[PDB]
């Protein structure tokens, strides 16, 4: 909207109230939009014997279809946008402007792979609040999209050549960060909830759990046409907004089909005092705030008058 001449501004994408607002907004859209047949949430207020809260309600089958949302300044505030093409997300931004609203952000809820988002303008970008801390998520932003085509018949397809090319570019970025003498290894999820261990997303209103092992099984700096991931549509789901469980009715459509563009990844690295010269990276995700961060990293909200 208007580029602030000769202004330097500090950003911190890891402490951004815009992310918190978007998180609460998306959580609300889901409550009012998706209705489970049964939902369970815990209640163990240190009283001893727990009391699970159980809600049972009409369970209509509805195709969910994420619509771009724009965030404009809240009353009394302004939105500053960083213009540095390859901004890491945390630090001084020299080329900053004021905008009326953010760009249109599709609120896609998923684990492991970020879908239908924004691409990096120059090279692949990796971001973390602390690269030294193995417990912190690493957000990967691709500069080229990879198609992933999924069907309710139980699989997803990805071009092996394209995926190979993107892995190479991600690994190059990772050793640029952790050591240019490092073998970069990709492995499957270590474990946890099903929504965490598989690439989890929604398509045609249904929850897909696709095994991503074939995507994360390679070593860098050390049949073959399409990668076909085995998929499962599930009815009993762990809630992402709060701790709890939701149950949905089985599918009613015989033709569930989605094609998405992979535009980023959520990764975690294996820590450890292993003085080996290799870093192990596994697909991660689960905190949807990281999904929103991947789009909001270039914005901050500042008090005006």
């Amino acid at each position: 909207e208007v580029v602030l001449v000769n202004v330097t501004e500090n950003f911190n994408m890891w402490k951004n109230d815009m992310v918190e607002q978007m998180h609460e907004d998306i959580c609300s859209l889901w409550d009012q939009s998706l209705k489970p047949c049964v939902k369970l949430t815990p209640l163990c207020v240190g009283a001893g014997s727990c009391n699970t809260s159980v809600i049972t309600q009409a369970c209509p089958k509805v195709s969910f279809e994420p619509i771009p949302i724009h965030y404009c300044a809240p009353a009394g505030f302004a939105i500053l946008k960083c213009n540095n093409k390859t901004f890491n997300g945390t630090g001084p931004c020299t080329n900053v402007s004021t905008v009326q609203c953010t760009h249109g952000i599709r609120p896609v809820v998923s684990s492991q792979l970020l879908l239908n988002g924004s691409l990096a303008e120059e090279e692949v970008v990796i971001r973390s609040v602390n690269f030294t801390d193995n417990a912190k998520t690493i957000i990967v932003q691709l500069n080229t999209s990879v198609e992933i085509n999924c069907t309710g018949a139980g699989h997803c397809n990805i071009a092996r050549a394209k995926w190979n090319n993107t892995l190479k570019q991600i690994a190059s970025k990772l050793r640029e960060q952790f050591g240019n003498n490092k073998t970069i290894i990709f492995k499957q999820s270590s474990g946890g909830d099903p929504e965490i261990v598989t690439h989890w997303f929604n398509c045609g209103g249904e929850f897909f759990y696709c095994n991503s092992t074939q995507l994360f099984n390679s070593t860098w700096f050390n049949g073959s046409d399409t990668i076909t991931l085995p998929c499962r549509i599930k009815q009993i789901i762990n809630m992402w907004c709060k701790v709890g469980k939701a149950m949905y009715a089985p599918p009613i459509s015989g033709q569930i089909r989605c094609s998405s563009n992979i535009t980023g990844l959520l990764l975690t690295r294996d820590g450890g005092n292993s003085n080996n010269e290799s870093e192990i990276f596994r697909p991660g995700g689960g905190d949807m705030r990281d999904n929103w961060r991947s789009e909001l990293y270039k914005y901050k909200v500042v008090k005006i008058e």
Partner: antibody
Amino acid sequence: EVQLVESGAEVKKPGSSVKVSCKASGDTFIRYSFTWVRQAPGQGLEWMGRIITILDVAHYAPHLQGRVTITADKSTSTVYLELRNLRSDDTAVYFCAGVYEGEADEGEYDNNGFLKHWGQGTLVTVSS
Amino acid sequence: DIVMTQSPATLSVSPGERATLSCRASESVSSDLAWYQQKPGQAPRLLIYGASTRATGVPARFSGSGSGAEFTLTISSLQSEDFAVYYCQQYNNWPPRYTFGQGTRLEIKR
């Protein structure tokens, strides 16, 4: 396949409570939902309620809501029906029934409302 | 509050002939309709679910049809062991309030 074996006949005074049980064996307990159905002498079948075993969540017929409780003990693969404040008209044969729901432990659940497997029935007589 | 009605209350059929049983719902139940057979002193036995799917162990002479609010159970040729009481069951609503018809008694005509 699951085999359902129920507890023995009960005789109660009006106002008493009763707890009948149903032992399910032969398959994986949490992959089944269990339903209680009663039949008064000379009458037809009446659905009382159904427990989604994996969720530990039961739903009851409206005319019974409040005085019926269905539970499941996963450790002993046993389903229980408790009926409170018994009335003479609660005299009936009480059947435990069940159906396979899919790989519930892997989050697959068809929520089937029909009843494939049946216990032998328990006579509950409520009389002064 | 879905009421299931079966007709007729009693059907008399000569051995080896066809029998057709009817079940009506007070509102649509889609295809969430099951049929049970019950003999005196025994538990009910599932014959048909999803309106037209034969349960395991059920002979081919039993056939279910219909959808919405109107259903039929057909027995192609009655054997000695088919004479029983037959019940229909609606399981379409959620939260679940499942209901049964009052049964059709199939008797031997002589």
